[PDB]
A paper describes a structure:
Condensin protein complexes coordinate the formation of mitotic chromosomes and thereby ensure the successful segregation of replicated genomes. Here, we identify a direct DNA-binding site in the eukaryotic condensin complex, which is formed by its Ycg1Cnd3 HEAT-repeat and Brn1Cnd2 kleisin subunits. A peptide loop of the kleisin subunit encircles the bound DNA and, like a safety belt, prevents its dissociation. Firm closure of the kleisin loop around DNA is essential for the association of condensin complexes with chromosomes and their DNA-stimulated ATPase activity.
Author numbering:
A (entry chain C): 458 to 521
B (entry chain A): 8 to 187, 205 to 401, 414 to 498, 556, 568 to 789, 793 to 816, 822 to 861, 864 to 881, ...
The structure:
């Protein structure tokens, strides 16, 4: 905002920042904290149209 | 009084310090005097109290607000200033006489405790500011008693699991400064935390130690693209030369391959720049040494890495010439450059530097020959060099007829060597194809070679039939020859002889090595003569049924290719095998996870045939979709990815294809819900497969009309009604809730009859929120009804 008036002792309920929190959730749920995947991608084999259109034993030739 | 004077003095500083950093150094200077005098008069606690009060005013300010950022820096600069005076007196060894140590230790301790009063506040803004203040003063708090140290670690260890990723990052920054416990806590967050920005924060700030480097570089496969890019953009760049010493060579090669083959361009370019610009510069322009690090002899990544370099640095490209003097010191690195440059310039038509930088064909034939002599008259390096030169030779210029014959007589002598490795037969024959004027000139020279090998074998015997090893050589050569033939066998007589003399005997006997070559040679001939393919369909069915996993591997590929080239004319007729017989051969292989390599060929192969319309059986197509969603095939990544790429393009390429999915998809969905519900039973080998709602909206997605590459069609419509008849056939409502909620992904608008029928069912299902979801459907539906009705 504009600025802060650090000379204000009038400021009411500024100690509210130190409240207890009762029934306000501040921790992430314990389920998500650990994941077996470790957030990596699986092995990638790169299946492309170029891959499929080609023959197995004669990769130079293509099919429709 | 003097208590209010302290407040006014400190508040005046905070009032001006929030607006600009200009006078912060002066602001610290006065704060230190206000403090010193305050303690002199016994009001140390008045200063500490008012200093805290003014800091509380910035705690609720949100992350971005500059005013909060400016006061956080003031607080940090103040503590850092007080500590510097204590460090100097210690480092310059002079005494402090005004209790500066005691005042500092007490101020810091008191201030952290005050700030920690809001570490668990409900307002996420103060929780962020609290950890921000902590993070930015950690370096300058000095030595603290154990009670405060325990309080800090416990407070942070709870904030590492804060609900906001913004606070968690700040929790990370705090714990980084306690590294050497805290190190394992950060590795725990680098792998397990769901937010990508915190994994990024942990990664970038985690100490790069032999213990931690594996976990840091592990993020080269992070699901987020930035985290992957940053591995090359910063991590690997920070290390510099240590990327070739303190990094395991096996993971090293895997990092380049990953970056250069990544599916995203940002990651690819990031890895490219690391190789072409950052590394190369770290090695002082020495391209040869850079290639020594990539290890051309034991890796193919360098093909992309050097082409990546050539694009980035065309200035170096014109500087690599090849005079006759280079061959005196020819190594694997230089040899790889020879092919890499020559092929790169042909592809991008930089013919400028081929007439002056490379020898003519006649001189290249001498050098290629030379190395052939050294090897077949370190053996690995020689074979490698021969391969690199031969690769270039295949694409060399033989306009000068002198160079064509020279090179030709060189490779013919090479291919005549009975000891020639397979990789050098492969490339040796491809060169002879480029040198030949036409196919007939190519096969005549090739078969002439082959026959000499088998005939010479019969003189050592007449010191009857050729040895088994000798047959492996002839079939290896012929297999690479027949791969390059493209005319019907009717035109090539000599290939008809090779069939009788060599190929069909190889299919007859054993070991595999000789039988596997016979099948590949046969399959390649079947691609040229439809009748030959008809007359060998029974043989190939036997090869997969009675052969080792390797023979199944080849014979299956042959079968799929014969179908791709000739279609359904090799099946179902007089003198022809039955389609349903081959369908069973594929199915038996497809579901045998004992050998998963073959499942991909069956899985992929069948997709190739349905896509070309050569296959069009509804029941078989359904076996594919189910093997994709199957729990047994989760282990086979290649199979899942094969089906994942094929069956979506099948539907979306032509509505007849998608029309097939619609008829099956209801039965498919049925047979996977019944499945998952039975994975709860006491018979296992659940999360090993998707849950029905995923499967449904997956199925429904394939059936959507507009995803095809011109009218509404209602192909999807017919799928849904089927899904509703099957419905109600379930033990657990949980999966009924799954199937029902994911409706409304439909495209609705024609064809009155169908939609009215759809409404009739939905009304019948008017038997928990699932009810709402279904009601959403009928109101939208009932509108379509009155609209069409009144249209008349």
């Amino acid at each position: 905002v504009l600025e802060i008036d650090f000379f204000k002792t009038d400021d009411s309920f500024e100690d509210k920042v130190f409240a207890s929190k009762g029934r306000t959730k501040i921790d992430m749920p314990i389920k998500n904290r650990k994941n077996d995947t470790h957030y990596l991608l699986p092995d990638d084999f790169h299946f492309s149209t170029d891959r499929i259109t080609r023959l197995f034993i004669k990769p130079g030739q293509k099919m429709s | 009084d003097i208590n209010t004077k302290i407040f006014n003095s400190v508040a005046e500083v905070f009032q001006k310090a929030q607006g600009s950093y200009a006078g912060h150094r002066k602001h610290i200077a006065v704060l230190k005097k206000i403090q010193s005098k305050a303690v002199e008069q016994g009001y140390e606690d008045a200063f500490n109290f008012w200093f805290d009060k003014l800091v509380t005013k910035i705690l609720p300010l949100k992350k971005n607000e500059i005013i909060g950022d400016r006061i956080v820096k003031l607080v940090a600069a103040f503590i850092a200033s007080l500590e510097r005076e204590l460090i100097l007196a210690k480092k310059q060894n002079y005494k402090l006489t005004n209790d500066e140590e005691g005042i500092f230790s007490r101020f810091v301790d008191q201030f952290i405790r005050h700030v920690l009063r809001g570490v668990e506040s409900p307002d996420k803004n103060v929780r962020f500011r609290v950890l921000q203040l902590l993070a930015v003063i950690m370096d300058n708090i000095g030595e603290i008693d154990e009670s405060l140290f325990n309080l800090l670690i416990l407070s942070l260890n709870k904030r590492i699991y804060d609900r906001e990723p913004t606070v968690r990052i700040q929790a990370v920054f705090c714990l980084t400064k306690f590294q050497d416990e805290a190190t394992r806590t950060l590795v725990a967050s680098i792998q397990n935390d769901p937010s990508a920005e915190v994994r990024r924060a942990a990664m970038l700030n985690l100490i790069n130690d032999n213990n931690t480097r594996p976990y840091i570089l592990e993020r080269a496969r992070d699901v987020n693209i930035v985290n992957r890019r940053l591995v090359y953009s910063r991590i690997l760049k920070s290390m510099g030369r240590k990327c070739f010493d303190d990094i395991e060579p096996h993971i090293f090669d895997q990092l380049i391959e990953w970056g250069l083959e990544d599916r995203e361009l940002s990651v690819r370019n990031a890895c490219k720049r690391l190789i072409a610009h950052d590394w190369l510069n770290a090695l002082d322009g020495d391209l040869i040494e850079l290639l020594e690090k990539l290890d051309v002899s034991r890796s193919s990544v360098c093909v992309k890495a050097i082409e990546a370099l050539f694009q980035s640095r065309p200035d170096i490209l014109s500087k690599i010439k090849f005079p006759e003097s280079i061959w005196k010191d020819f190594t694997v690195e230089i040899a790889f450059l020879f092919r890499a440059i020559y092929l790169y310039c042909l592809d991008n038509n930089i013919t400028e530097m081929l007439e002056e930088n490379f020898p003519e064909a006649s001189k290249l034939s001498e050098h290629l020959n030379h190395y052939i002599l050294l090897r077949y008259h370190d053996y690995n390096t020689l074979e490698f060099i021969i391969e690199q030169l031969s690769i270039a030779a295949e694409r060399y210029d033989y306009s000068d007829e002198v160079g064509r014959r020279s090179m030709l007589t060189v490779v013919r002598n090479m291919l005549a060597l009975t000891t020639l490795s397979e990789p050098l037969i492969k490339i040796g024959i491809r060169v002879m194809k480029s040198l030949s004027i036409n196919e007939k000139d190519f096969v005549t020279m090739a078969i002439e070679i082959i026959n000499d090998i088998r005939d010479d074998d019969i003189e050592k015997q007449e010191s009857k039939e050729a040895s088994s090893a000798t047959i492996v050589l002839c079939l290896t050569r012929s297999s690479y020859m027949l791969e390059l033939v493209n005319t019907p066998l009717t035109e090539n007589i000599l290939i008809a002889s090779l069939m009788d003399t060599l190929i069909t005997p190889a299919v007859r006997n054993t070991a595999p090595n000789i039988r596997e070559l016979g099948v590949k040679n046969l399959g390649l001939c079947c691609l040229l003569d439809v009748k030959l393919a008809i007359d060998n369909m029974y043989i190939l069915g036997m090869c997969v049924s009675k052969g080792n996993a390797s023979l199944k591997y080849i014979a299956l590929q042959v079968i799929v290719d014969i179908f791709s080239v000739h279609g359904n004319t090799v099946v179902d007729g007089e003198g022809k095998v039955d389609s349903i017989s081959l369908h069973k051969i594929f199915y038996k292989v497809l579901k045998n996870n004992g050998l998963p390599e073959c499942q991909v060929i069956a899985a992929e192969g069948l997709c190739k045939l349905f896509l070309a319309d050569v296959f069009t059986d509804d029941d078989l197509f359904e076996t594919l979709v189910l093997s994709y969603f199957s729990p047994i095939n989760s282990s086979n990544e290649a199979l899942v990815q094969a089906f994942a790429f094929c069956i979506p393009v099948y539907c979306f390429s032509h509505p007849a294809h998608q029309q097939r999915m619609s008829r099956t998809a209801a039965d498919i969905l049925l047979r996977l819900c019944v499945l998952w519900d039975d994975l709860q039973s006491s018979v296992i080998p659940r999360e090993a497969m998707l849950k029905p709602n995923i499967i449904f909206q997956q199925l429904l997605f394939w059936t959507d009309p507009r995803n095809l590459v011109t009218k509404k069609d209602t192909v999807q419509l017919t799928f849904l009604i089927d899904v509703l008849k099957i419905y109600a056939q379930i033990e657990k409502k949980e999966i009924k809730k799954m199937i029902i909620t994911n409706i409304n992904a439909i495209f609705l608008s024609q064809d009155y009859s169908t939609l009215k029928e759809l409404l009739e069912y939905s009304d019948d299902i008017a038997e928990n929120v699932s009810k709402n979801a279904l009601d959403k459907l009928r109101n939208n539906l009932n509108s379509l009804i009155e609209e069409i009705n009144e249209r008349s």
